[PDB]
Amino acid sequence: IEEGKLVIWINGDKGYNGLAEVGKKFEKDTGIKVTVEHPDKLEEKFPQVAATGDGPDIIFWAHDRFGGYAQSGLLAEITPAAAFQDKLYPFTWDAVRYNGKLIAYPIAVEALSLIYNKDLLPNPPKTWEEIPALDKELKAKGKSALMFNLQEPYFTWPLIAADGGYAFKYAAGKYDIKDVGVDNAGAKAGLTFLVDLIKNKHMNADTDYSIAEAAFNKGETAMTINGPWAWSNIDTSAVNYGVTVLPTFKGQPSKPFVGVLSAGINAASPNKELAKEFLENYLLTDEGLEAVNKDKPLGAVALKSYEEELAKDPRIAATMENAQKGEIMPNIPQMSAFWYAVRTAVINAASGRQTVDAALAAAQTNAAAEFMDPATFTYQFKNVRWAKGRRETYLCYVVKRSESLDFGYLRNKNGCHVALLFLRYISDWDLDPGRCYRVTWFTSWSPCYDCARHVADFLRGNPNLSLRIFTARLYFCEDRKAEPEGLRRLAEAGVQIAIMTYKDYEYCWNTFVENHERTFKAWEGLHENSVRLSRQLRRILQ
Ligand SMILES: C[As](C)(=O)[O-]
Ligand SMILES: [Ca+2]
Ligand SMILES: [Zn+2]
């Protein structure tokens, strides 16, 4: 990693030649060389390539990706002056805030808007409630009122959240992953309205992005819901199209997720002051943003002065308005479980498989985290030999795609063993045979014979699923030594079985436990018992 020199990473779909122009001016004035790279898949790169040797000095990406970096400690904390912060819209600073600290500079703002055909619909509706009648009217004329992608919750959330639904509760640059607004009354209302639009044949349950885009671009529908990225395509077609504020629901604005293009600084960068000088005095300026805007449109921008210039284009003003009425995309990783849950819900409610209430309840439980009591964990997962009296069995689990679809813990309930309860849970999911899933268990007890058997058969029935089991203790029922054959059966089915080591207890302590910010405290003989049990399991597995 060079010193006295700036290396900038930004995606290829951005304005990087304009950015290179900016860096050229910076190099001209300060004699400090600046090179813009736009490598393919840089956002996947950075969390690793930068975590060790070097990376870029500055990285441009949507803010939600930075949170994951920030907790890894890969992003330098910034403290720009109030005088500089006032140059940007205050809500954009909230997007670059992680755990109370500012981890990046806001650049651009994007959100969904209501795109309408001006020839079909010169006066687009202000409310969602208007849309059924309007559709009934347009369907007599061979058109439809509205088509947008219903398959992805990103597009359907603005309506669902309007009456008070939300992802995670946000305070002072911090998100509560235990607080989730998915099954609350507002979300119920919004999703009920959507499903009612489908039941009444105003919209179609199978409509997706390309279908909606094709429909609107060909003039087959009066409205669609979409972002700036779609605009040029509509430019190619012949459609007279406006872009305006999303319709209200029950008097309240639709609330789309707001992406914020942001510039983070490498925590491993020697050049941090150079980066701040560049970003503050060169990039974020009317001229600096103008430069990259010439190359490719940023959409709406975080800088007030230039946004006032860009907003003379009413579609950008619409983008900004919808953004200011929407909610900031949470930058926490648990968001991935949100996406999967809500999507599922919205599908199951749209096809009539589930009621709105049931779907949103399941989605709520999936998205919201439930943490174990610390004393409970310490007692139940102790790997020592006084292994009797732990009469229950606790199972911590993570379900992935690498995307973390679910995580949490179970315990034996009403006589039913915990492994079977998990099978019961995961069975209910509709898993795509096409896709592959990775499930990880941390169990206080190793499964008994019957549990191990049912798990083995389940995994035989689902080859797209793979399972790792990290166990604290090895369970045996008296007078059999049936259990070793069960474990052996699991290994035969392709289960990876291992005894929990210190690092596993660390992970569980900082993942599944409510620890009140206390470090994991090992007991005496943890490693000893772990090795002993490891040996023993090694004997059993042959
Ligand atoms: C060790 As058991 C009772 O969870 O199969
Ligand atoms: Ca949960
Ligand atoms: Zn069992």
Side-chain angles (χ1 to χ4, degrees):
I1 170 65
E2 260 277 276
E3 193 149 325
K5 198 261 184 177
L6 284 177
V7 177
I8 297 179
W9 281 9
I10 189 173
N11 202 75
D13 76 291
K14 320 258 75 155
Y16 62 83
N17 279 343
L19 193 53
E21 205 85 26
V22 183
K24 278 166 197 176
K25 215 216 170 176
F26 188 75
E27 186 211 89
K28 187 181 182 188
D29 293 15
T30 75
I32 299 293
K33 217 231 176 301
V34 183
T35 42
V36 177
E37 300 176 14
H38 62 68
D40 167 271
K41 292 308 300 190
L42 65 98
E43 90 273 12
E44 272 190 326
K45 290 179 182 190
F46 189 86
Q48 283 191 337
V49 290
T52 51
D54 35 354
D57 296 295
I58 307 178
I59 173 174
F60 286 78
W61 202 263
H63 73 279
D64 63 294
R65 192 72 190 86
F66 285 0
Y69 301 166
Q71 209 211 323
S72 289
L74 311 180
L75 286 179
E77 172 184 5
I78 61 174
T79 48
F84 180 81
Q85 294 195 38
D86 297 334
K87 285 171 168 152
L88 311 192
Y89 295 98
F91 77 92
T92 65
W93 284 113
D94 292 329
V96 292
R97 196 162 294 144
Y98 185 85
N99 218 29
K101 311 190 188 73
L102 296 168
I103 40 85
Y105 290 83
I107 309 298
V109 175
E110 72 165 357
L112 291 173
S113 288
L114 180 66
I115 306 179
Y116 68 97
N117 194 324
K118 307 184 80 158
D119 293 323
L120 292 175
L121 196 64
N123 298 118
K126 290 291 177 178
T127 73
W128 277 93
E129 293 90 337
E130 280 167 272
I131 293 183
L134 179 63
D135 177 72
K136 180 174 175 56
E137 194 166 64
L138 285 164
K139 229 124 184 181
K141 290 164 182 164
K143 309 298 183 182
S144 49
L146 177 63
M147 286 178 68
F148 66 104
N149 179 16
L150 306 184
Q151 311 306 315
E152 291 298 328
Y154 175 88
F155 292 87
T156 59
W157 190 252
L159 170 60
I160 299 175
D163 197 33
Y166 59 90
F168 301 97
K169 186 136 291 178
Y170 172 82
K174 193 165 183 172
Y175 285 98
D176 188 354
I177 60 180
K178 291 172 296 155
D179 199 344
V180 170
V182 162
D183 71 343
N184 70 35
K188 275 164 150 63
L191 184 55
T192 295
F193 191 84
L194 191 73
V195 173
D196 283 341
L197 280 176
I198 295 173
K199 291 206 307 180
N200 289 312
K201 312 180 187 181
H202 299 310
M203 290 202 318
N204 220 285
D206 56 29
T207 297
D208 63 22
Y209 190 87
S210 67
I211 292 164
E213 178 171 46
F216 185 84
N217 291 5
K218 291 182 187 176
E220 293 172 0
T221 190
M223 291 175 297
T224 188
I225 289 174
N226 222 332
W229 58 83
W231 290 357
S232 75
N233 271 5
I234 319 182
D235 284 323
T236 293
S237 72
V239 168
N240 225 36
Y241 79 94
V243 175
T244 188
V245 62
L246 293 165
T248 61
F249 177 63
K250 295 167 74 74
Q252 295 154 117
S254 293
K255 296 168 60 48
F257 285 115
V258 180
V260 175
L261 180 69
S262 303
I265 297 177
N266 209 327
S269 177
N271 295 309
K272 299 179 182 183
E273 262 299 306
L274 283 173
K276 298 173 186 193
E277 290 159 7
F278 171 78
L279 290 171
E280 293 180 13
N281 301 287
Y282 284 85
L283 180 54
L284 290 149
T285 31
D286 296 343
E287 297 78 12
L289 296 181
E290 188 158 6
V292 329
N293 194 47
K294 301 283 185 177
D295 200 21
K296 298 208 189 71
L298 290 166
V301 298
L303 184 70
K304 299 182 177 184
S305 62
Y306 192 49
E307 167 65 17
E308 289 170 13
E309 176 64 41
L310 291 180
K312 289 174 180 176
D313 176 22
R315 50 198 189 136
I316 290 179
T319 301
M320 177 53 70
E321 186 173 353
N322 287 312
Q324 295 207 52
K325 275 151 156 164
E327 75 177 290
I328 294 295
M329 173 101 60
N331 51 12
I332 58 182
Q334 182 67 2
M335 199 63 184
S336 66
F338 171 85
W339 292 130
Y340 172 74
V342 176
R343 181 187 141 88
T344 295
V346 177
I347 274 149
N348 289 350
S351 63
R353 204 226 216 84
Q354 283 188 297
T355 66
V356 171
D357 293 346
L360 287 181
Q364 169 76 27
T365 312
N366 194 288
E370 245 183 0
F371 295 113
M372 192 187 310
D373 195 282
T376 294
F377 174 80
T378 299
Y379 177 75
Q380 299 293 345
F381 279 84
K382 235 161 192 161
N383 65 340
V384 291
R385 283 211 252 221
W386 1 142
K388 147 221 109 127
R390 323 302 217 261
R391 243 163 76 84
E392 43 263 315
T393 309
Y394 278 70
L395 187 159
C396 300
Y397 69 89
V398 180
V399 181
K400 276 178 163 77
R401 261 192 192 136
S402 93
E403 85 214 300
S404 209
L405 307 166
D406 198 25
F407 93 100
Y409 82 98
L410 295 171
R411 57 181 305 271
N412 58 281
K413 225 76 143 187
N414 314 327
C416 186
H417 295 171
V418 69
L420 292 188
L421 285 177
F422 185 90
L423 293 183
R424 192 167 295 175
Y425 173 63
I426 197 69
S427 272
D428 259 82
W429 284 28
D430 268 335
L431 300 167
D432 182 22
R435 295 276 237 157
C436 281
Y437 305 78
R438 284 174 181 178
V439 179
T440 301
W441 292 358
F442 302 86
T443 57
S444 56
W445 281 116
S446 63
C448 71
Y449 180 77
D450 294 286
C451 274
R453 197 153 172 279
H454 284 75
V455 172
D457 283 288
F458 172 82
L459 288 169
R460 204 241 297 104
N462 298 261
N464 58 325
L465 200 136
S466 85
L467 176 67
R468 300 183 308 163
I469 302 181
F470 297 92
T471 184
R473 300 177 307 265
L474 286 178
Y475 173 77
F476 296 113
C477 73
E478 250 320 331
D479 319 305
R480 256 295 15 199
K481 257 249 204 247
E483 276 73 38
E485 223 249 323
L487 302 175
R488 213 140 46 233
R489 235 102 106 124
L490 286 168
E492 284 150 26
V495 187
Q496 258 148 62
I497 311 170
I499 306 299
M500 288 181 65
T501 60
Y502 183 71
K503 62 139 177 130
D504 298 331
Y505 286 104
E506 282 182 287
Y507 178 83
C508 291
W509 180 259
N510 291 280
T511 303
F512 311 99
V513 178
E514 191 110 54
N515 50 48
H516 308 294
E517 324 308 317
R518 311 291 265 102
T519 48
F520 173 69
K521 181 210 294 186
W523 42 90
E524 188 170 63
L526 194 154
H527 180 67
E528 166 195 341
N529 293 312
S530 184
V531 173
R532 195 190 91 257
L533 287 168
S534 187
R535 256 141 49 74
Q536 182 179 354
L537 177 65
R538 199 173 80 74
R539 260 133 52 191
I540 291 176
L541 292 187
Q542 301 299 351

